[PDB]
Amino acid sequence: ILELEAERELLNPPPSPLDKKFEQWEEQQAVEATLAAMKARRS
């Protein structure tokens, strides 16, 4: 199972840790930046 689980890790590479910072930051923006309009529109 671990071998089959790792098999997908090669055929389907996991997202690099870089996006984990961007995806969270961008998602933080996706809320905060989208909330930068709301917290300024509907504070």
Partner: protein, 49 residues
């Protein structure tokens, strides 16, 4: 409605779930615009054909 009467905590969580659906609109919406020119050229080819 969650924001009403200073209940911003519920609004913050409700918006997080919307971003998941917003990613669909961007991915699915962009694909539709690309197929518009795809169907326009094929029809013009048939008209000329």
């Amino acid at each position: 409605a969650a924001l009403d009467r200073g209940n911003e905590q519920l609004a913050r969580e409700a918006l997080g779930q919307r971003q998941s659906y917003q990613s669909h609109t961007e991915a699915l919406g962009k694909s539709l615009g690309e197929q518009r020119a795809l169907v326009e050229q094929v029809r013009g080819q048939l008209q000329k054909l």
